[PDB]
Each structure stands twice: as C-alpha cells, then as structure tokens.
C-alpha cells in the first residue's frame, strides 16, 4: 500500500484501554492514519481528546452519524473506521458506516444476534466493504506456524481441540464470558484448522457471582466436530489467580502442539513416544509464513501490540485488495473478516440455547 | 512404634510378569510394615514357586490358587493377616470377596470391581468381617494432597466453585471402560481428600474410542458434574493425550483463590490468590501443616518420588487394619485412606459416566436411579 | 510534553535496530523524525527516508552535512540518535554534541575511558544529554526489583548474578562484554544505585578462534564495596539460548530473579516462604512500577515497550535540561551509564589480557 | 540374579539421631542387596543397642564403637563383608582405614577425608586390601546422568566449552570448607560422569562467609576451571541462595548444542541443539540410551526420586564389590560408580579451591605443587 488508510474512530477516547492498542496497531508502520474520528459522548472532552492526537479541531464529531455524513463531503475523507464503543452499539454504527461506503473494524464481538450479523453481512457485500473483527490474538506468528504443520500433516489426523481463555479479573447482550472470551480460543481454533466444522454442541454455564444471572461468569462448551473429532472450550471469568489463562491445545494421532496467550512467543510442539519440543518465535525452523512478520530478531519477546500491528496489516490488505478489485490478492489474504463475525455470533447463541435448555445437544 | 510387628502379608499375583507386583513389594515392605510369608503369585505353579522362593517365601506357602492359600493360611497361627490382589482386573471381585470371607483385610489394585453391585457387596462382608478393603490410589499418598485438604479446610480458596481434574496421558495415542476406570477415577480420589463434604448431585460423560478397534471402551472421555451446592466439576480422561507422559492434574478454583497439583511435578504445589503473586508450596517446607509433614522421609528440596506415596499409603493401610483389630472406630476414622467407600465410589462414579456416555451424554443422577420416562 | 521533540536518525536505514528506535521515539508522538542520514547511498537513503515521510531535501548524505544545514532551520531537529557501526559512535556523538543537539547513541558510547570522559565533558559544556540505549531498564519489573530492594524486602544484597548468554554465534576492544555484558550490568545499576565495585577479575575466551582476540564467551567476578559479591556470565556462544539474559539479587532475608524472555514476570524468593512470583501490571505493585503501563496485566508486553518506556524518559530529560530545571526526578541510562558501560568493558579486558589478575575499578 | 546372597552389611553411625541413616538403609536394602547384620550404631551404647535391634540386628552384634566391631566381626565365620560410614566428616578418615585394614569394603558418606595425602593413604590401602571404597555422591544414581553421558560421547554437542555447574541453596541464609566439599562436590562428580575424559589443568576460587562466624569456612564459593583443551569450568557453591530449595544444576555446553539438568526435577533432561527446537528429554522414554534404561525401576511419567538414585548407586557398589571378590579387573571396569578415586577427586578439588581462596583466588594447578616464588 503505497499510502496510509485513512483512517477514524468511534469511541476510544480518554482513558481507553481498547482504543489504544488499535491505533498503535493501526498506526504502526504508517499503514492507517488517523485523520478524524467521534472519541466521546461528551463532545467537549471529545475534542480535547482528539487534538492532543493531533486531530483537526473540525474533525473530531459529536457522534458516529456526523462524522460519517460530514466526511462524505470531503475529497480527503476517511475510507475507514474502527468501532471501539459498547457491544450494544456495534450493529447500528457497523451497519451505518457499510451504508456510507466504508471499510470497518468492528471490536468484538460485531453484534447479538445471528440475524443482525446475517444483515450486517449483506450489507458489507452490497457495499463491497470488508468487516474485520478484533480476534487480535491471530496476529502473532506462531498462530500462522500452527496453521502450517496441522496442515502440512505433523500431528496426523486431528482429535481434539481443547481451548480455553479463563481468567479470574472477576473472581470478587446474551452472554458474558462467551462472547467476551470464549471467542477468542475458537478464532485461534479457526486459523489453526480451517477445514473442522462443527456439527452440534452443548453447553453449561454458571453465575458464580450470582447477581450477573442471567448473565454467566464461566461456561463449558462440549462440541463434536464433523468426522469424529471433539472440541471443549472453557470460559471464565472467575478462574481465581488466573492473569488470562488464554490456551489451545491442538491433539492429533501423532503428537499435540499447544499455545498460551501469556507465552506468546513459544508453541509446544509433543510428538508421541519423542522428546517435547519448543518452538521459538523468529527462528529458521518456522514455515515461511510464520516469519514474514517477526518485526525483531528471535529471542527479543513481542508481544501483543504486534500481533494486533499485524492483524491490522491484514485488515489493510483486504480493504486495498478490495478496492482495487484485486481478486488474487484478496483471497491471499487470511484476516478475522465478517463471517468470522457471523460465527462468533453464532457460536454464542447456540451455547446459550443450550445452556438455556439444561445443556442439551445443539445442531451447530 | 505403632506397627510393633509386621502384618503378615501376602499378594494374588504380582509375580514374575506382574508389572505392578514391584511397587506393592516395595511400598509393603518399607520400614518392615508388612511382611510377605505367602502368596498365590503365577497361574503357572513352577514359575510361581520359583519366583516366590527368590522372594525368601516359604516354598509351602507359595499357593497354587488364592483360595488354596485362603483355606491352608486360614489354618494356621502364623497364617497370613493381610492380602494384596494384583491380578487382572476381572478377578478383583472375587478375590476380594473370598479374601474378607476367610477374614483377612484386603488392599486392592484398583478398580474394586466392575458393578455397584457387587462393590456394594464387598462393602457389605467388609462390615460383616470386621476387615478393611484398601483400594490402591496411590497418588494420595502425596504429602502435598494433604497440604491442599487443609488449605481447602482452613477456607484458603473462599467457597470452592470448580473442580478440575485430568489423567490424560498418550502413550496409546496408536470390564464397562477403559479409560475412566484406569485412569479417571486417580484424580478423582484426589478430589475426594481435599473435598470429603463435596458430594456430586448429576453428571454427563461423553466418551470416545479414537483408536476404534477398542469400542465401546474408551481411550477418551470428558465428564461434567455438579455437585451439590451449586460447584462444577470436570474430568478429562485420555490414553490419547498424544505427546503427554502422564498429565495428571487437578485444580481446585474458589472465590478468593485457586490450587494446582500435577503428578509429574508432586513435590509443588501452586497457590494464586486472586489479586495476589501466585505462590509455590514445596514438599517438606516449615509453613505446611503437620499433616502434610508427617510423612516426610528426607528433607525438603530432594525430591521424594511415587514409590514414598505408595509406602505411605501402604503405612495408612497398616494403621486402618491394626484400628480395626482393634475395634477403634474413632482411631479408625482418624485413618485418612482410601478404603471401601472409597472403593465402591469409584465403582460408581465408572458406572455412571457410562451410563451417560451410552445414552448420548443425558445427565444422570449421581445416586439413584435414572429413567428415560418416569 | 506539549510538543514532539524534533528528532533525527543517523543510520539505521533498510535494520532492526533502526526500526526499534523508531518504533519507541514515535510512540505516543514523543518525538517526530524529521531528517536522517538513514545510508551510506544517497539513492537508498533517500529511499528509505522518503518511505517513511521525510522531505527528501532533509534526507541528508552524512552526518556533518545533516547538522551543518539543519542548524539555519527553525524546525531543526533538536536530537539524533545514532544507530551506525560503534567505531563511529564516538566521532558521531561529539559532532552531535558541539552541534548543540541532544543524543542517543546505540549500547557502546565508544571505545576507550579517555573518549568516553571526553565526551561526558562535551556534554555538560553543550548541556545537552547522551542517552545509552539499555533498553531493557524499560521494562516495569525492574522498577519493581529497585522498589523491593530500597524498601529492604531482600535484607543485606550479598550476590548479584548476571548473565547475558545467547547461543546464535556457536558457530573495539572486546566483543560480548561489551554486546551483551553491559545490558544486565545496568540493570543492577538500576536495581542496586548505591552498589559501589571496589575491584574485578575477568576470563575471556574466544571458542570461534577466528575472533581472537575478541571474546566470544566471558567471565567477570567482582568485590563491591561493603562485601557483596557480584558475577557477570557474557556469551554468544551458549548453544540452544535464544537470549539469556538474568538477573538475580541475592539478599540475607530473599532473592529475587528476573529473565529478559519472559519480562513480564519477577521471581520473589523469600528463604523459608513459598517463593513468589509477581506479574507487570498487578496492584501490590509499587506505584512507579505501574505508571508506564500501556495495557492490562495478563495481556504481555513486549520490548518494543520497555524500548518506548526508555525513550520517553529520554524525552523528560531532554525536556528539563531545555527548560532548565524536574531532571533530578527522571531516571535515565544517561552520558555516566555510558561512560561506566566502556570503564567496566575496558577493566575486564585488562583483567583478561593479564590472565585474570585483578584490577582497581577505577 | 547378580548379588545371588545379600551382602553382610553394618553401619557406623545412622542410628536413631542420625539424619543419613535412613536413606543409606532404604538404599541398601532395596532389593536385597545388602542386609543389615552389624553395626556402631551409637555413642551411646544403650541407644545405639536398642535402635539396632528395631532393626533386627542381634544385641550381639551391636558394638560400642567401629574398632571393636571390625575387630570382632572379623573372627566371625558370617561377618560383615562392607560397611557405610555415616559418621561426622572427621572420622571418615580413621574409620575408612580401619575398615580396609580389617579387610571390609567401604562405602563412606562424603566426603571421604579432609586432605589429600589422607586420600592417597586410603587409596593405597585399597589397594593393597583389594577392597572398594564407595562414596556417595548419590545424585548420579539418577538414569538422565547417564543419558547425558551417552549423548556427550556420541558427540551430540559437538565439541564441550564450557562446563557450568552450580549447588546452591539458601538454606542457611540466616574440615578445610563447607559448601565447597559439602555441595560443591555434588555436581563436580556429575561432570566426571558426564565427561570423564576432561581433565582440569588449573582453577582459581573465591570463597565468603556471610555469616561472618562462620569463617573461615565458606558458606558460598565461586570456582573458575580451566580444562586441558581449552574447554572451561564453573561451579558456584553456596548454602546462602535465599529462596532456593537446592538449586543444584549442570549445563554442558558444545559446539553444536547443550544439555541441562535439575536436581529438582531429576527425571527431565534439556537438550539444546543450537538452532533447532529445545527439547526436553524424559526418564524411561524407548529413545534413551539402554545404559540410562536398565535402572528404571517404573515406567516414564510416573516420577522416581532420590530414593531410587541412591538405591541404583548402592547397587553399584555391590557389584563393584563382586567383581572385586572375583578379581575380575575388566568387569570392574564396566561399573560406573563414584569409587576411591572420585573420592580421591573429590578431597583434591576443595583442597585445591582453598588453597586458591586462601591466596586470594591466584590460579594454581589442579595437578602439582603451586609456589608462590620459584
Ligand atoms: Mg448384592
Ligand atoms: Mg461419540
Ligand atoms: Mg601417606
Ligand atoms: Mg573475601
């Protein structure tokens, strides 16, 4: 891409975890470029936010709906946007932002029901738009070196795919966890083993901290894939001494490989009957794919930010890829795009079908 | 001091081909809490014999069968007081059972039995001859399972939330079930002594044959339970945890903190109060409870290994069968092993992870009787 | 910091190193890079220049050329950094120096103590400052590590183990005590302030005999005042190590360990405790620990962080110096880490050349 | 098979105050290879006659003191053949000689004298006795030590560099040494396994009493070696390294890959191909050498501890002694054990390392006599 996206945000404004890392990531490398955006509901603090950004006084909207007619108006007006505000928002601004011709990055999860996600992705065919979702744990490297030896045959046929992300911050929408964490691993599960496909699932999940009910602060969800392989994902929020707790571990006739969030850089890699091996970030050994990123010599530990740079990288590609009507260079490009959204989405809603219904068997 | 005079034991099995012969002998025989006299060792009386005289075993009193051995021993002053079955697991039940009808307490290589029936019947003569039935969970006998009962108890974790456990380990990645059975229910009894007042109310299993020459028993199986008071409990059971050489864990979660233990790792333990740093508790260590210290043999930092956890849960049978000749209930209830309760439990906890699994993982009363239509 | 610092690069063109500088300098717009001598070739250097914005007039074909013509601009750069071979960080400081601009200069501040010393009085008469990039003093927990050992949590420091010992070449005056020794030696500058070396002795070999009389594997033991010993392990030779780079602090009372692959973590070891381990980001943290946060504990960061977290202090003291005033509050590996960087390397290969004998620190 | 009759055996010492008395037991009598029949158990006579007779050793055979028991025995038709000494470290010396003179084989607790002319004088004896003298630098009992070994020697690091070692821990936070030859000595053996073709030309030490009322003993040393070949050496003796529960370590480093190995976590070996994805190496795994196989006393996964390192040294030792009884010098050879001359090594090493401490850590040769002028 010979020039900066450019670029603008809906929410994310001060004191913004969320907002942060998606403009280092987008920033990074000069791949987006953030010309405008709506920081805060409350318009004053909104601008006093966006100058210190270095955002123009006349652009930094009082709201989504302003920013997107007002941008119109201008020959240098944003191509793009990300959607950092609350889950209850995420369908209407995605579904505004397609209606008015731009590219977007939704944070997760892209909406609450199948049907608004089934809408959301017309639209974004109709208007020949991309729709990324923030499943920035993809981005890092290791991910794409998983991906390769699963499909390359290293671990033989597959047998189960045991994930988790359970954490236990909370310890003291129609879903809490799931939506909030359990996505995460199955992306990563996504990436990892693009051809499983889930045939029917069942789900437990509990309100530890009774008042969220019926909102649920842990989950289990049993699923069977099609072909004989079995999935099991563990959502939490209430994994007391738990930092994150973010893991899969991929099982094959032939040996497992195993991933932690906390330990981005290394993967495990356990041939049956041979000594364990750990594979490092950055090294020789990695398929090519797995190297293309390293943005420092191995050893150096990254970390999330450049995972998140590198998925942003991505959402670049398809949106140029797109524009200019580069079919080949499209479909070279692997990114959380709107139907893994539409997955997210209803993944959750089948878990909480079954959760609702005493955790009986789901067809996926 | 408490075992003034070694139990005359003997063993089913555990000869020349036994591969779990070894482990009974050592941990038996540590510090001369048992001594060996007798036995009905190999199918094959020559080689039986053989073995049993290299064992320093009166040739006499090196049996055919079990119940030759259990009608001749029965005869004499010297005769055995103790017997440890280590024959293939479909003789357990009939062993076990002549064994306590000729009066003598019994260790069993794990599982009991097949049914709950019939390890209800043990349970039943059990009581009837005053015997004990030791059942052989050996990776109780850890002294850092007893640090995390008294943490659990002294309410370190807040109130307990999840149980979870896993045995899976992949070495075969190439009676009713396999892998729940074989390897399923170890972390379970470890559930068992850190949680004796968690009593589970339903479960569902989901069970697998990968390697499908070996249906309907399973290489795999995964079970959900809740247990009363609203706690989950989970066991990943596995012989095809490819890469994996053992992989027993078990992690206690509660409102205020969490416990881990990992049998490939039994001299930590870790402790992570939630908002806290995460801590690691060393075998042998000053800050443990005397209950977990007991049992020491040597001191912290060289590392003891499951040949000291047999020999102390070996040592905990000795003293349940010296209470119980005794007719000591109070002494005896003071014995933390894994006896015939323990024993039956695990009978059923099988039975009904299978049930589930055979009926399309349907949740299932832990006790009672479940139905399709009632 | 209302406004970025004007900054420059020298060197550092079509090289990672160059890409961490500027990753960390324009992070949170700290600094905004302006000019360059980004290479060698005029043609790529202004290639790569121009990739990454700059006017191409300001593309510059050499260092001097650069801070000749920047100095008639009223949007002059005010600092450069220099990332190009070390046998020119010395003459390219000095030049940076007289030209009144502020400096940060890549690990080796120079050769020689006599440079060295030159160059720290070129500083304090320009008033201007040399940052060293220890970079690795940016990550949180070792402010963390420096808290713990202030408030007395170690009791009396006896030992002090450091270690950079990599293995990729298994196959100046020194080589890794100079590379790699140096970096966890001003970690315990940071953890330990007031720890003084009365005397060291130091072993070098060169296992790749090609590199001789350059070390590529190094020993270094030392008697600080007041009885606490210290130990330096440098390598690159140390086959299956992606980095090694530890730290540990070993008091009367605990120890605490710290490894540069797993910088989010700090090892807390209390004798007679359960041993400890303490995450970046977490609320029993020391407040000065947790301020450069950028994201929530659980989430790792990464090098890139450490490396923005240094160059922001760089900023501060760059900032305080200008407005002369505020600078005693930041802490910094400044022109006196460096000079000390080059003493250290310079006493152990006296050390090494007289096989071992030991040598007065200063 | 190989040890067809237990080995007579008494110990000097270990008895019911003694804190090495129990492993040296549970070593020896593993498997039969040794039985108990002797003993000086005790200063104390009273003490020493009823600790040795829960023991089942005859009140005859309880002796006041080592002299009286060789002396006696001696006359004996079924006398002691070895005896361990378990002794304070200034005893070892007197009562190993006597020992030898009386024609007894010896296994002696580290280390096994204080100087080495002593060392010389007992290895003469030797000798001249045709006796053993174990010591027990029991650590190398472990299987992975000798996996090392194997893979050291079929060149799978390349050529050796550097040799770090390290036994470490804090401990006490709060003869010519102390760590030096009560540590350090652990894991030097390990490297004479490891690398026994590797020979120390000359090394400097530097050795600290923190707790100053310990000098001039140390209570933590530093030790640099230079090798003959060019490869070089640490080791870092301390009791001093707050927070460490042993802390005992060995990393060999070649030119092509290294090799870790943990005290702590005794059945896992690291091995580093530089390059190449670390592994990890596990005890009783099908790719291990034979020789770090036969040992096995359980299948991998489950973890063995050191218990059963000292148990395989103690068998060592008795088929040292075999061999020796045959005067078969060739088979003799074949057994890997830490015998006179480790022993003789092990002496050597700490008097060298203090005579460099004491001189303020100048180099002087491992071999020969260092001057200060000549
Ligand atoms: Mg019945
Ligand atoms: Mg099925
Ligand atoms: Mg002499
Ligand atoms: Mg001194």
Redesign the interface.
């Given at each position: 891409i010979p020039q900066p996206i450019r670029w603008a945000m809906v929410g994310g404004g001060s004191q913004s975890?969320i907002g942060?890392?998606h403009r280092?990531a987008a920033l990074?490398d000069?791949t987006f470029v953030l010309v405008a955006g709506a920081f805060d509901i409350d318009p004053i603090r909104g601008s006093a936010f966006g100058e210190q950004?270095?955002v123009d006084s006349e652009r930094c909207y009082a709201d989504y709906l302003s920013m997107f007619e007002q941008e119109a108006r201008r020959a240098d007006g944003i191509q793009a946007v990300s959607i950092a505000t609350p889950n209850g928002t995420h369908y209407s601004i995605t579904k505004a932002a397609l209606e008015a011709g731009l590219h977007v990055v939704c944070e997760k999860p892209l909406c609450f029901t199948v049907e608004q996600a089934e809408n959301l992705r017309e639209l974004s065919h109709k208007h020949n738009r991309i729709v990324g979702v923030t499943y920035g744990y993809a981005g890092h490297q290791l991910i794409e070196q998983a991906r390769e030896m699963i499909a390359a045959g290293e671990?033989?046929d597959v047998?189960?795919v045991?994930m988790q992300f359970a954490?236990?911050?909370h310890?003291?929408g129609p879903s809490y966890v799931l939506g909030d964490v359990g996505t995460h691993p199955l992306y990563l599960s996504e990436v990892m083993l693009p051809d499983l496909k889930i045939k029917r699932l069942?789900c437990?999940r509990?309100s530890?901290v009774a008042s969220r009910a019926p909102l649920e602060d842990?989950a289990?969800t049993?699923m069977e894939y099609e072909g004989?392989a079995?999935g099991?994902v563990?959502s939490s929020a209430?994994?007391?001494?738990?930092?994150?707790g973010q893991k899969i571990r991929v099982?094959?006739?032939?040996?497992?490989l195993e991933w932690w969030?906390?330990?981005?850089?290394q993967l495990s890699?356990?041939?049956?009957?041979?000594?364990?091996?750990?594979?490092?970030r950055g090294?020789?050994?990695l398929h090519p794919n797995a190297l293309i990123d390293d943005?420092?010599?191995?050893?150096?530990?990254?970390?999330?930010?450049?995972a998140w740079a590198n998925l942003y990288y991505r959402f670049a590609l398809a949106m140029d890829a797109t524009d200019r009507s580069d079919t080949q260079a499209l479909s070279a490009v692997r990114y959380p795009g709107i139907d893994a959204g539409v997955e997210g989405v209803r993944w959750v809603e089948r878990c909480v079908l079954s959760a609702d219904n005493?955790?009986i068997?789901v067809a996926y």
């Open positions: 975890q942060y890392i280092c990074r000069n950004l270095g671990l033989g047998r189960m045991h954490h236990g911050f310890s003291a069942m437990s509990q530890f842990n289990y049993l004989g079995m099991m563990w209430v994994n007391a001494g738990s930092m994150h099982i094959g006739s032939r040996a497992s969030d906390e330990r981005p850089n890699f356990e041939v049956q009957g041979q000594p364990a091996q750990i594979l490092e090294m020789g050994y943005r420092i010599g191995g050893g150096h530990p990254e970390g999330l930010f450049e005493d955790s068997w």
